[PDB]
Amino acid sequence: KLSEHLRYCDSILREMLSKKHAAYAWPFYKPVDAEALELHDYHDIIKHPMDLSTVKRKMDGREYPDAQGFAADVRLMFSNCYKYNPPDHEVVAMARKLQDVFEMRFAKMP
Amino acid sequence: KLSEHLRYCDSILREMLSKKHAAYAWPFYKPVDAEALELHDYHDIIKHPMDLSTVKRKMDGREYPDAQGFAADVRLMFSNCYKYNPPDHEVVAMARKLQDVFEMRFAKMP
């Protein structure tokens, strides 16, 4: 039931979740665990959390109207990370690496 | 063609390669890349490298005679990491976390 574009988006998502990128993608696999990380202000600063497991369930649920909504969620995920953390944080470097993977594959969508 | 024991060992290997443990297991997914990491002495100190992809190909190749040979390779992987790196290194903490997963599942083998 997926468009040609969202089928391509689903393949981007599968790649971002693959062991190939695990070294920098793993903090985004699941929702940020503010409880385990003791980040008592995380849900005050980040009003709309996002992560790859959430993007996957929405894609599998056929909840994205077009490829543009898929991209908006992925970039929200990266944006929340840049918003919450100091620019020198290692998770910010990991987000930028994974975002480089995303933007490159997304731009090359036929 | 696998024993009941090595079938259980194969399930341990599948778990160690799952996204569940990726945060600390990813440096062991593939052989240590001394070229990319510029570790010009790595193959002088580590005479017998080992990693999870190598354990997997041996298991798939039916190259382990028993569960004891499987365990010897997994512990070689951890041992090489403790041998090469300083004890305070983050990859040593990651090895100990993954080894805790391994030893616990291995000990509970029926």
């Binding site: 385990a36 919450y84 944080h89 998770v91 | 945060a23």
Partner: peptide, 9 residues
């Protein structure tokens, strides 16, 4: 108050 990644596990 800073996020510590290893504290996730």
């Amino acid at each position: 108050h800073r996020x510590v990644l290893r504290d996730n596990y």
